[PDB]
Amino acid sequence: QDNREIVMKYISYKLSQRGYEWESEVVHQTLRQAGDDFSLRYRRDFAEMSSQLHLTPGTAYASFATVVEELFRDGVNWGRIVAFFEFGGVMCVESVNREMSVLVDNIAAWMATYLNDHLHTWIQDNGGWDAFVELYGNNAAAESRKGQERFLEH
Ligand SMILES: CC1(C)CCC(c2ccc(Cl)cc2)=C(CN2CCN(c3ccc(C(=O)NS(=O)(=O)c4ccc(N[C@H](CCN5CCOCC5)CSc5ccccc5)c(S(=O)(=O)C(F)(F)F)c4)cc3)CC2)C1
Numbered sequence: 001q002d003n004r005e006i007v008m009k010y011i012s013y014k015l016s017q018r019g020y021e022w023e024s025e026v027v028h029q030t031l032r033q034a035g036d037d038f039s040l041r042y043r044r045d046f047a048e049m050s051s052q053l054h055l056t057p058g059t060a061y062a063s064f065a066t067v068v069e070e071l072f073r074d075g076v077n078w079g080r081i082v083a084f085f086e087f088g089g090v091m092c093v094e095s096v097n098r099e100m101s102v103l104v105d106n107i108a109a110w111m112a113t114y115l116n117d118h119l120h121t122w123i124q125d126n127g128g129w130d131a132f133v134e135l136y137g138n139n140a141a142a143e144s145r146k147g148q149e150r151f152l153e154h
Pocket of ligand 1 (some may be wrong): 034035037038041042045046049067070071077078079080082083084086087090132133135136137138139140143
């Protein structure tokens with residue numbers, strides 16, 4: 001899976017997108033693109049989450065854990081995983097904006113731990129990051145179709 005490198009590479013890019021300096025290339029690039037797609041499609045949620053976080057060093061973990069628990073409460077799908085990356089992105093960007101840059105390493109650790117300890121089994125059972133890339137390439141009708149075909153498979 002190489003979940004930790006995916007995290008670091010992702011955060012390093014969202015922080016470049018904002019101006020600061022901090023597994024196949026296709027996985028990295030596809031995750032970036034999917035993330036930008038999610039943030040455009042769910043632009044109200046993105047902006048509102050940004051506004052409603054109140055990051056301090058003392059509340060960062062509670063904030064992270066609350067949101068991630070809510071995100072995966074009813075189960076996992078690839079879009080929720082993308083929302084998780086985007087959420088982590090937001091936390092990192094606002095950490096730096098607010099001159100709390102120490103949190104960035106913390107958030108990256110929390111994200112890698114969550115992927116390894118709570119998303120790893122799902123990812124493996126759902127075809128790995130290869131199936132993520134495959135789905136991204138498919139149009140919505142194709143994606144719904146391979147979902148029902150994968151269910152009927154195993
Ligand atoms: C409880 C709480 C407060 C918790 C906190 C929180 C929250 C708030 C702010 C922030 Cl910041 C973070 C979290 C919320 C907000 N909630 C979070 C969850 N939300 C989701 C909404 C939709 C889905 C979904 O749809 N999931 S999905 O069915 O699995 C799926 C479908 C399509 C594709 N991708 C296609 C790609 C199309 N191709 C492109 C290339 O040319 C060919 C066509 C469309 S783009 C695309 C479309 C959707 C997602 C990503 C990319 C992918 S995907 O990109 O991951 C892939 F395909 F799998 F790779 C997967 C999952 C969850 C709704 C908003 C709620």
